Design a protein around this ligand. Structure first.
Ligand code: NAG
Ligand code: NAG
Ligand code: NAG
Ligand code: NAG
Ligand code: NAG
Ligand code: NAG
Ligand code: NAG
Ligand code: NAG
Ligand code: BA
Ligand code: BA
Ligand code: BA
Ligand code: BA
Ligand code: ZN
Ligand code: ZN
Ligand code: ZN
Ligand code: ZN
Lengths: 445, 443, 445, 446
């Protein structure tokens, strides 16, 4: 015996795990079987009390050694077969068939759908940790996959499963293939099918609703724990798991111009980018309706010139405006006498710090558009207040007459004319073609 | 004679860990030092990036192997010293001395106070997983101790620390000694003192208020994760970490008359028992106020007779009442039309031919009320449960009723209640406690 | 007892280091392992990326602190085991047993062979820095050795290894025991054998050949860097690493008559002396066959009188000749017209400075014999030029009438009669019995 | 008690004024700590005063010395270290603590005083990019605050900062010190204090200077190679190269797993290697345009052109597509099928191992190359008979080549498929231009 059946995805209140376990022992009484749980499942499972059937409780406990919560402790065979609840062994010799498939193939995982209502389908999957995004889609090399959707027995070497960081994190159907796809591993969907339980679990609308609410709750906690802020299907059907109008932003107070996600070797969370685009769009719309001359500035102008979007590691949006136009905007003139929360939840405020305005996504989510007011004195756009940035600099007004439409972050914003020049004056030649982080620093990148 | 300094207790927003680490590096530039954190601390700690100083991130990650979060894999030496933030090495050799004490003494752990505003004090500590309770007190054999309260450098063998199930769970001061005391290990509180940092962390009242709040949240999550519902102290102070009026009870629906906690070799969570005793005292009060004749029944009577309280694995309270006084109680009158939530949050229902009073709308810990009526001097009812002890009984057992301490108050019980309990449960029931369904699980 | 495995001796292009590391991890998953290299090995070593296995790069780097290239900072354990490529921990607890022998014995190093085609041998070793010589032999008190030859696991305290000046210079088999034997330390060769790799490295004849080539290059660079000119073995076999006919001599131009090696508290390099003795022999043979009367002069005669050889810190060879005889010698005849390279590559020249001749070992190697022509005036040998040496004096011709045989540099040379009186006349009384450096006012014995 | 250790590292053994240097500092304070550092014992002898505060630090390994003997911090007991070049002399008393006081009261971690030689220190700007293997020098925008110095200066900094560098005394210190300090974001303040020149300066003849300069340039070239600086520039120009060229091998060995060695070193392609690829691309394009072979930028080269008009900074070759029916118009290509062909300009044209493609190597020794992939139109889809394990090696509609479009690339104008943006996304996926990635992300990520 070289395969250990391991059952992780089931619900204590309604399962067919005893039928599952029995079905395998009917084919081999010596079959190693591990049912894994965080706490002792209740009502009792009453699995057969034989040495090859073991219940693995994986949460830490005051009375148990460190090994007791490590799943590899309970597996002494070369391969592990992850079996979902609802499956049943009916035809004999099917785990051996799966081993021979995995031996002969080039994929580190092999899988056989279970004949449930939701049998496994083959999926493509890329994990971008820099972008906190998991991108799913149809599998162009089926039956060679990056991930599975639905019910399948998945077999792989124990050494591969248990060297992952979160081998049994729930839902397995999500956490396993996120880890295996990131490592460039593939799973081969075999033309073998496991039968379904004769008494399938969760066979009522109410039990299914309970299971799905808990399943979705575990998935949401799993993606947040692992830094997946966004799930997409074919670039759409977007599923968010980050910040929003009602939460704080994902990273909070930046020190040394280097936000926390850079030290995590990632870029700006996509929920944060989404909020910045929406605030930029809203603020631009407000200034255009009020008759405020604005133009993309600093990193926003640079990002618009390079790829027409926010630079993917940047953390705010900066606009220049004519200072004499400020009185035209109600939120702005309100923001010079104190903090203003407008009809749509955006907070307009004048950070007395550097003599500029700041518009935050909401009272709790402090992703902001900074507005830098400019006034001409002897033909140059210049303010008697600056900060320690190379690109906080005076510039001749002719860059602003006329202004130019430039795509930026989903809409068309205004830019200085000859913006390519303009950007080279402020950042240096070749800046559009040579990306950079905001402050190297005594470390990496 | 090699010892790794291991730092776990610090706040990312306000810490003195750079000074801590640099102070040890002053005594030995190659001192092995491990800073452990769940997530990457920000603002950056900006530790010296030298091979002997390492940052151990303990949470799972899509792009790291299982080993990357296992702390023993960062520690190669025989001994480890847990150093709290705010501490510092000044005089040389203090770790070597603590090693010397460990090898000469008999305690598996040695410790040295840090001269902060909360230097470590010695405490006794008794852990009862079966009762979800940890009990602290003053240490009779100090400086031999079960646990510590306050700041100390703790040194032990790495094989000892890392074979624990949760060696670095926060707060370490709570988590560590719960696990070591449960094993019968002692900590010896040595005479050595570590100096405090010169620029101590949490210097403003605002900052320590933040730290203590987040410290309190971590401790509550820790105790819930590891099955401590109650912390008690000599002197009577009680710290609750379980259910209450606004939560669910701690255990789900009971199958086979055998609750989930018994299969975990544990008894009723002490918070659930507290709720039951509170519901018992309230319902009794309402019934006496309304003039309803009640007596303790079933397991409540048994526990009252045996030790004047709820049987420690029991999960409800049972009272008999006279059929005919039901109408005297407003809540009971209403409970027959439908579910009544009275002014104190209790939920009166009828459903069975008995009444049920639940602690609250969310907490379904309940007192069951069993109405009986006399037929021929025999107390009877019209529907029956599949319980040996659910039977008719002579009414003279109610004529009269006797005062009996139960669950903190004086209840009413049948006269000759030991004979009463023997009639329903069988002989010797008081002296021979048994789980509710020994066919499934027996005590 | 905690022990860090430290791997230094391997080749990037062909090794069994992953197998080595893996085999120790199979006995303790948290085994601390340090792989040391001067540059990042490419192709990638692909060690398990786990915190207890670390790669230490011993190169300077602009973005790393001093500590990153100092290997002691990677070793936290009391003990360290140097393990060569091609070895494996197959038996549980071999390092522990090596640790116990170290504490029980008196040797600072303990060693275990590995069952390769060349398991470690026990050797004696004396190091003489002053003579630039390392002398190996059979070990008189085996299993206690000064040095090993072949593959072994070598265990010692980290404090002892990393207090050495060059703990990990390659080849470690040579470098380590030069340093430990010079310090009087012993290495006890235990009766413990580590296994060889299942796939040993260098399975082909081409890579086995390419490894020996880089090894010998590393070995020669090591001994030159450390000042070992000569390695000898019982059996007489000699390995040289200094002068030859085709290179320059080891030391540059001598100022103050005090060569650079003397200031380093060493004597003349053994290759330089060898060249001088072969040049003296050759020149004597030329002058004798030419019928040129010659005699041992200056420091050569003094050395001959003391012990029949060159003074061990001396840097040339001196012979006096009769001036009227130079025309008898073909090489001397051409030398007056210009530089002459003769049948054996020796270079005969008439010196710029003082009316004397000089014979260089070769065109590139300027170790030389100086020929001092004298002529008789009134029974007194004289010349028209004079050095600022006290022993550069006239002398009576009867000292040359006749000459006496005197062994020098492996052959029999002609010397003045009464050479004791001759030497004392030129150097002052007691010179034979009182060795002194050529310029005691700058550097004395 | 003195708080500065004078440290002398830049001098020549055959010709120096280090004895005069040491004596001048001892004349202001006879107890002044003075360290002279060398790899080997300097010969002729320096014959420094045999007092305990004057020490020779030999920084090479030795069979009879402890580890500490070759570490420079072993020789310094003071908080501060003054790096003093040969040719300086202390005549004004107390200058060393004016430098200590200036460094304490300022914000630069280094301060420096010029030495009044013929080459007095000038303030410089310096940007070090390890990823691009480049050191960019220029005029200092915020003088007297600098990133680097050129010329002779006493440089004072804390021992803890100097000796925590990886190569604190690597020669030339004028190069190695500031490459390390500028990489860390440290500044050096050129103070308004002057040190006097040696009364009898070293290297006073042309021949002595010529020997010193040849040795110095050899140490500088070895230093830059060891430290991974392939290119030095002054104001973007005056390029100075220390990498590969036409006569050497390329900088990185044979690539395995599509991931060259420089990626594992957390670096991008060496700039010498990129230069050779741009030269070979321009040459090969020039040859094919002259011979009448239709070509187009392909693969990573087309992708780099569309994004920023150059080779992608971590890419290792250039790929062009050609019409197979045009191969016969190029002499070098028709010879490539029969065997390897070195053309008159040193480029090597070969037909592939298997793969039915052509490879043009920069030179016989330097195997950076332009790969040429020929296709032909089956039913209007361009195809080849064999394929690669890469995602982007597929067929494509022929209309993407009727017409071809100009596109700037690598310093010249090359031909691209029309609508190259859509062409790129079909082969690589949507958004490829706006989202850059590495060749094998599962092994090594950007
Ligand atoms: C995943 O990434 C690959 C990159 O090779 C790309 O070709 C593929 O289309 C991507 N799939 C999704 C669904 O984004
Ligand atoms: C992780 O991989 C190593 C190498 O195969 C293996 O020996 C080890 O047992 C694996 N770990 C677990 C927990 O399975
Ligand atoms: C722990 O149990 C002992 C009896 O063994 C008891 O005396 C002690 O008081 C308990 N500990 C505490 C803190 O109550
Ligand atoms: C647990 O203890 C054993 C025996 O001392 C030891 O071998 C093992 O390494 C320990 N586990 C750790 C340190 O994680
Ligand atoms: C080493 O020196 C000892 C003592 O002088 C001597 O007895 C022995 O022969 C020497 N061994 C070798 C190999 O030269
Ligand atoms: C050198 O030995 C001493 C013991 O005297 C020890 O303290 C020190 O750590 C050692 N140095 C190194 C680099 O191991
Ligand atoms: C160095 O980098 C800065 C910041 O990008 C730039 O402004 C400056 O021009 C650069 N200087 C040189 C000489 O490259
Ligand atoms: C590096 O700096 C620390 C102070 O931060 C100092 O203790 C240490 O000695 C320094 N290292 C060296 C080699 O000078
Ligand atoms: Ba910006
Ligand atoms: Ba009960
Ligand atoms: Ba001589
Ligand atoms: Ba390419
Ligand atoms: Zn966000
Ligand atoms: Zn409770
Ligand atoms: Zn020699
Ligand atoms: Zn190159």
């Amino acid at each position: 015996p070289r395969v250990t059946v391991l059952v992780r995805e089931f619900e204590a209140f309604d399962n067919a795990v005893p039928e599952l376990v029995d079905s395998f022992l009917q084919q081999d009484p010596a079959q190693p079987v591990v049912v894994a749980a965080d706490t002792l499942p209740y009502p009792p499972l009453a699995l057969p009390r034989i040495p090859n059937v073991r219940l693995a409780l994986l949460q830490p406990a005051l009375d148990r050694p460190a090994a007791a919560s490590r799943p590899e402790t309970y597996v002494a065979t070369e391969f592990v077969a992850l079996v979902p609840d609802g499956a049943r062994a009916e035809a004999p010799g099917l785990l051996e068939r799966m081993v021979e498939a995995l031996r002969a193939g080039s994929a580190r995982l092999v899988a056989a759908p279970v004949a449930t209502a939701n049998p496994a389908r083959c999926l493509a999957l890329n994990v971008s940790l820099r972008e906190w995004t998991a991108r799913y889609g149809a599998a162009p090399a089926a039956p060679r996959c990056d991930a599975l959707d639905g019910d399948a027995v998945v077999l792989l070497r124990a050494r591969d499963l248990f060297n992952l960081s979160a081998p049994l994190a729930r839902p397995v159907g999500t956490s396993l293939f996120l880890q295996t796809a990131l490592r460039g591993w593939a799973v081969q969907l075999l033309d073998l099918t496991f039968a379904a339980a004769r008494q399938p679990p969760l066979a009522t609308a109410h039990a299914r609703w309970k299971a799905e609410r808990e399943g979705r709750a575990r998935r949401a906690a799993l993606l947040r724990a692992l830094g997946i802020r966004l799930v997409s299907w074919e670039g759409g059907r977007l599923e968010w798991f980050g910040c929003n109008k009602e939460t704080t932003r994902c990273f909070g107070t930046v020190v040394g111009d280097t936000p926390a996600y850079l030290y995590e070797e990632r870029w700006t969370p996509p929920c944060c980018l989404r909020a910045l685009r929406e605030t930029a769009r809203y603020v631009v719309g407000v200034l255009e309706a009020a008759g405020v001359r604005y133009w993309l500035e600093g990193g926003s102008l640079l990002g618009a010139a390079r790829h027409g979007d926010i630079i993917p590691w940047d953390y705010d949006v900066d606009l220049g405006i004519y200072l004499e136009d400020v009185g035209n905007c109600e939120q702005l003139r309100g923001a010079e006498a104190g903090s203003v929360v407008d009809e749509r939840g955006f907070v307009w405020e004048k950070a007395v710090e550097g003599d500029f305005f700041r518009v935050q996504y909401s009272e709790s989510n402090h992703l902001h558009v900074d507005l830098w007011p400019f006034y001409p004195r002897n033909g140059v756009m210049t303010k008697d207040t600056w900060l320690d940035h190379r690109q906080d600099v005076e510039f001749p007004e002719h860059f602003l007459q006329p202004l130019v439409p430039l795509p930026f972050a989903g809409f068309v914003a205004q830019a200085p004319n000859n913006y390519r020049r303009f950007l080279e004056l402020k950042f240096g030649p070749g800046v559009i073609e040579n990306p950079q982080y905001p402050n190297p620093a005594l470390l990496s990148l």
